Design a protein around this nucleic acid. Structure first.
Ligand SMILES: [Zn+2]
Ligand SMILES: [Zn+2]
Ligand SMILES: [Zn+2]
Ligand SMILES: [Zn+2]
Lengths: 73, 70
DNA sequence: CCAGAACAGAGTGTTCTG
DNA sequence: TCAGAACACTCTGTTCTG
């Protein structure tokens, strides 16, 4: 029955900012939208985002967050 | 004057290849240490001063292909 | 100069709270 | 229920040292 993060496939802690996610992707999304970051993809803007590689490309991670419908209101 | 790994300003010839300091210490730490680097793209990730943190796997790959060794 | 050590920061992830 | 605070850890890069 266990719930899965729609961003990285890790265990989802709950519905955060409109989307079923884990804590890491939650706080990441908050920090990313509000914070001033220089995220730039090194691939083709389609990087695989899972528990191991989510640290690799913050750009694609934020992209998946936004496309999932995450918002702060 | 330019790092053959990320194109940043090269500090000198390290481990056999003209590199900067960051790629020097990165290479040593990567080779000796037990890391779980995994590429999220297609093994052709752009490694420059801005994005070199993104894919350690491809960075290490460029180091090895450059001939770096201990 | 070059190798290695050591110090410091960015980014991240978990725990705790209401 | 979920949002936010805050501490702690990993990885990295510069400075220091032999
Ligand atoms: Zn997640
Ligand atoms: Zn990417
Ligand atoms: Zn370099
Ligand atoms: Zn890569």
């Amino acid at each position: 029955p266990q719930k899965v993060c729609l961003i990285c496939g890790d265990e989802a802690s709950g519905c955060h900012y409109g989307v079923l996610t884990c804590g890491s992707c939650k706080v990441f999304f908050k920090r990313a939208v509000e914070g001033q970051h220089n995220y730039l993809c090194a691939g083709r803007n389609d990087c695989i985002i899972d528990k191991i590689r989510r640290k690799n490309c913050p750009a694609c991670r934020l992209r998946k967050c936004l496309q999932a419908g995450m918002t702060l209101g």
